[PDB]
Design an enzyme around this catalytic site. Structure first.
Site, PDB file in Angstrom:
ATOM      1  N   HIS A 225     -48.615  15.443  -6.231  1.00  0.00           N
ATOM      2  CA  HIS A 225     -48.238  14.278  -7.035  1.00  0.00           C
ATOM      3  C   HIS A 225     -49.394  13.423  -7.558  1.00  0.00           C
ATOM      4  O   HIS A 225     -49.562  12.271  -7.162  1.00  0.00           O
ATOM      5  CB  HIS A 225     -47.247  13.408  -6.247  1.00  0.00           C
ATOM      6  CG  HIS A 225     -45.925  14.075  -6.005  1.00  0.00           C
ATOM      7  ND1 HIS A 225     -45.144  13.810  -4.900  1.00  0.00           N
ATOM      8  CD2 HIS A 225     -45.257  15.012  -6.718  1.00  0.00           C
ATOM      9  CE1 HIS A 225     -44.056  14.558  -4.940  1.00  0.00           C
ATOM     10  NE2 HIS A 225     -44.100  15.297  -6.033  1.00  0.00           N
TER      11      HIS A 225
ATOM     12  N   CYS B   3     -47.887  23.274   1.938  1.00  0.00           N
ATOM     13  CA  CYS B   3     -48.857  22.971   2.979  1.00  0.00           C
ATOM     14  C   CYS B   3     -48.363  23.522   4.312  1.00  0.00           C
ATOM     15  O   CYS B   3     -47.183  23.466   4.612  1.00  0.00           O
ATOM     16  CB  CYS B   3     -49.059  21.467   3.111  1.00  0.00           C
ATOM     17  SG  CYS B   3     -50.211  21.042   4.438  1.00  0.00           S
TER      18      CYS B   3
ATOM     19  N   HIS C 280     -36.889  13.064  -2.618  1.00  0.00           N
ATOM     20  CA  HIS C 280     -38.262  13.571  -2.639  1.00  0.00           C
ATOM     21  C   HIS C 280     -38.218  15.087  -2.489  1.00  0.00           C
ATOM     22  O   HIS C 280     -37.416  15.610  -1.716  1.00  0.00           O
ATOM     23  CB  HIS C 280     -39.075  12.944  -1.495  1.00  0.00           C
ATOM     24  CG  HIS C 280     -40.543  13.242  -1.557  1.00  0.00           C
ATOM     25  ND1 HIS C 280     -41.076  14.451  -1.165  1.00  0.00           N
ATOM     26  CD2 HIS C 280     -41.586  12.496  -1.997  1.00  0.00           C
ATOM     27  CE1 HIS C 280     -42.384  14.439  -1.361  1.00  0.00           C
ATOM     28  NE2 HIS C 280     -42.719  13.264  -1.865  1.00  0.00           N
TER      29      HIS C 280
ATOM     30  N   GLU D  81     -40.097  17.167  -0.886  1.00  0.00           N
ATOM     31  CA  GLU D  81     -40.309  17.691   0.464  1.00  0.00           C
ATOM     32  C   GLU D  81     -38.997  17.625   1.236  1.00  0.00           C
ATOM     33  O   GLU D  81     -38.667  18.531   1.998  1.00  0.00           O
ATOM     34  CB  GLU D  81     -41.386  16.910   1.229  1.00  0.00           C
ATOM     35  CG  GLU D  81     -41.543  17.423   2.669  1.00  0.00           C
ATOM     36  CD  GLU D  81     -42.558  16.655   3.501  1.00  0.00           C
ATOM     37  OE1 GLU D  81     -42.331  16.541   4.724  1.00  0.00           O
ATOM     38  OE2 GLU D  81     -43.577  16.180   2.955  1.00  0.00           O
TER      39      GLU D  81
ATOM     40  N   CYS E 110     -48.063  14.158   9.341  1.00  0.00           N
ATOM     41  CA  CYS E 110     -49.345  14.845   9.463  1.00  0.00           C
ATOM     42  C   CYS E 110     -50.540  13.942   9.756  1.00  0.00           C
ATOM     43  O   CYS E 110     -50.492  12.719   9.577  1.00  0.00           O
ATOM     44  CB  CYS E 110     -49.628  15.645   8.198  1.00  0.00           C
ATOM     45  SG  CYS E 110     -50.071  14.589   6.822  1.00  0.00           S
TER      46      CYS E 110
ATOM     47  N   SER F 194     -46.297   9.516  -5.759  1.00  0.00           N
ATOM     48  CA  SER F 194     -46.910  10.006  -4.529  1.00  0.00           C
ATOM     49  C   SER F 194     -46.402   9.185  -3.355  1.00  0.00           C
ATOM     50  O   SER F 194     -46.746   8.017  -3.211  1.00  0.00           O
ATOM     51  CB  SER F 194     -48.431   9.908  -4.598  1.00  0.00           C
ATOM     52  OG  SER F 194     -49.002  10.228  -3.340  1.00  0.00           O
ATOM     53  N   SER F 195     -45.575   9.802  -2.518  1.00  0.00           N
ATOM     54  CA  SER F 195     -45.016   9.130  -1.352  1.00  0.00           C
ATOM     55  C   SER F 195     -46.078   8.573  -0.401  1.00  0.00           C
ATOM     56  O   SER F 195     -46.022   7.399  -0.025  1.00  0.00           O
ATOM     57  CB  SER F 195     -44.095  10.094  -0.589  1.00  0.00           C
ATOM     58  OG  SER F 195     -43.591   9.504   0.598  1.00  0.00           O
TER      59      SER F 195
ATOM     60  N   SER G 198     -53.524  12.970  -2.491  1.00  0.00           N
ATOM     61  CA  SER G 198     -53.557  13.813  -3.688  1.00  0.00           C
ATOM     62  C   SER G 198     -54.448  13.287  -4.813  1.00  0.00           C
ATOM     63  O   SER G 198     -54.454  13.841  -5.919  1.00  0.00           O
ATOM     64  CB  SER G 198     -52.136  14.008  -4.223  1.00  0.00           C
ATOM     65  OG  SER G 198     -51.480  12.756  -4.365  1.00  0.00           O
TER      66      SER G 198
HETATM   67  C1  LIG Z   1     -47.887  17.966  -0.343  1.00  0.00           C
HETATM   68  C2  LIG Z   1     -47.586  16.674   0.360  1.00  0.00           C
HETATM   69  C3  LIG Z   1     -46.439  16.447   1.171  1.00  0.00           C
HETATM   70  C4  LIG Z   1     -48.446  15.520   0.293  1.00  0.00           C
HETATM   71  C5  LIG Z   1     -49.772  15.424  -0.472  1.00  0.00           C
HETATM   72  O1  LIG Z   1     -49.698  14.671  -1.699  1.00  0.00           O
HETATM   73  P1  LIG Z   1     -48.503  14.136  -2.570  1.00  0.00           P
HETATM   74  O2  LIG Z   1     -49.062  12.817  -3.223  1.00  0.00           O
HETATM   75  O3  LIG Z   1     -48.827  15.273  -3.471  1.00  0.00           O
HETATM   76  O4  LIG Z   1     -46.950  14.210  -2.398  1.00  0.00           O
HETATM   77  P2  LIG Z   1     -46.181  13.133  -1.493  1.00  0.00           P
HETATM   78  O5  LIG Z   1     -47.113  12.129  -0.708  1.00  0.00           O
HETATM   79  O6  LIG Z   1     -45.295  12.382  -2.432  1.00  0.00           O
HETATM   80  O7  LIG Z   1     -45.289  13.945  -0.478  1.00  0.00           O
HETATM   81  S1  SF4 Z   2     -50.497  15.031   3.250  1.00  0.00           S
HETATM   82 FE1  SF4 Z   2     -50.329  16.206   5.232  1.00  0.00          FE
HETATM   83  S2  SF4 Z   2     -48.589  17.675   5.031  1.00  0.00           S
HETATM   84 FE2  SF4 Z   2     -48.911  16.748   2.873  1.00  0.00          FE
HETATM   85  S3  SF4 Z   2     -50.479  18.344   1.969  1.00  0.00           S
HETATM   86 FE3  SF4 Z   2     -51.731  16.855   2.966  1.00  0.00          FE
HETATM   87  S4  SF4 Z   2     -52.133  17.626   4.977  1.00  0.00           S
HETATM   88 FE4  SF4 Z   2     -50.336  18.783   4.230  1.00  0.00          FE
END
Ligand SMILES: C=C(C)CCOP(=O)(O)OP(=O)(O)O
Ligand code: SF4
Length: 309
Positions: free
Chosen positions: A41, A96, A124, A126, A197, A225-226, A269
């Site tokens: 995201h 992931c 969401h 996920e 995580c 982005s959560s 992200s």
């Molecule tokens: C892949 C996951 C769960 C988290 C990493 O970043 P994100 O910004 O891409 O997505 P969310 O935090 O909204 O789950």
């Molecule tokens: S935030 Fe945590 S679960 Fe989501 S991609 Fe990154 S390491 Fe994996």
């Protein structure tokens, strides 16, 4: 004005892996490469990938026959995985490993006909993918977002109950929900704590330390982005002004006028180049050298499948 940098911040192991999966696929098979939903995201990351040849779609229907498809880092339901397998599509899963781990536990509970409860935010991806790992009508898969949701949830057999959680939730809020689940269903089983995580736990811990020093906190990350939102929310709850921004251009002067200390962090992200540009903007607005705070060391790396190396 002093500029503080939270640590850790930015890219987690899952994100770095998911992006590399798309880049390497593109380098190996050339463009175009289809990806179901944003791989991660982040608007900039997604844009950069399109430049390299990636095409992001929302439904498998949009994907042509014979095309390469990549599942986003957030994961997908079994239905989607099946829909892609029932098609003439080559698939690469960027989910992931930490999300996959939760997936397994769900599918496991689903095979034992035992009901499971997921703590997460409705809508969401996920949550959709994780809820989508349950398919046994004899049991059940329920979603709860707060203690209130727990207070009104009724299950078929609370003697055989387990719970799982989204990986990017607020550590504090989730704690409250788990406490409620145990008071409601004393026999419920789950992980020692939760499924949040290390990256989520660490970035929240880091933004907390940052918030106690800075009057204003800027969190680099996209609206959808959560985990990024959780960072801004935490800062705001500590009484500091906090803003979620995609880039330096979103910075409004009034936010930092006469502010002696501004803190900057980034969701899991958000690429470091975005943070660098934010620091540059803050500096022309009077900020000095960005000072990185001391913080938790992260050493985990998730390699791309050998097939894409
Ligand atoms: C892949 C996951 C769960 C988290 C990493 O970043 P994100 O910004 O891409 O997505 P969310 O935090 O909204 O789950
Ligand atoms: S935030 Fe945590 S679960 Fe989501 S991609 Fe990154 S390491 Fe994996």
């Amino acid at each position: 004005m002093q500029i503080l940098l939270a640590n850790p911040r930015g890219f987690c192991a899952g994100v770095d892996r998911a992006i590399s999966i798309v880049e390497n696929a593109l380098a190996i098979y050339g463009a175009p490469i289809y990806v179901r939903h944003e791989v991660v995201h982040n608007r900039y990351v997604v844009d950069s990938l399109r430049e390299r040849g990636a095409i992001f779609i929302e439904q498998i229907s949009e994907v042509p026959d014979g095309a390469i498809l990549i599942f986003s880092a957030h994961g997908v339901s079994q239905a989607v995985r099946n829909e892609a397998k029932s098609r003439d599509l080559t698939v690469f899963d960027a989910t992931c490993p930490l999300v996959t781990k939760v997936h397994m536990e769900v599918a496991r509970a689903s095979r034992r006909g035992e009901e499971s409860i997921l703590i997460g935010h409705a809508g969401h991806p996920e949550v959709e993918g994780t809820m989508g790992q349950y398919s046994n009508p004899e049991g059940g898969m329920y979603l709860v977002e707060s203690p209130d949701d727990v207070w009104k949830l009724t299950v078929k057999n609370e003697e055989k109950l387990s719970f799982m959680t989204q990986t990017t939730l607020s550590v504090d809020d989730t704690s409250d929900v788990i406490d409620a689940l145990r008071k409601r269903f004393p026999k419920i089983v789950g992980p020692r704590k939760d499924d949040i995580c290390y990256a989520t736990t660490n970035r929240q811990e880091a933004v907390r330390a940052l918030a106690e020093q800075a009057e204003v906190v800027l969190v680099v990350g996209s609206k959808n982005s959560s985990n990024s939102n959780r960072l801004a929310e935490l800062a705001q709850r500590m009484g500091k002004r906090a803003f979620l921004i995609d880039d330096a251009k979103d910075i409004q002067e009034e936010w930092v006028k006469e502010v002696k200390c501004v803190g900057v962090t980034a969701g899991a992200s958000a690429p470091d180049i975005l943070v660098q540009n934010v620091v540059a903007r803050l500096q022309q607005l009077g900020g000095g050298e960005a000072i990185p705070l001391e913080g938790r060391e992260e050493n985990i790396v998730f390699e791309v499948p050998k097939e894409l190396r």
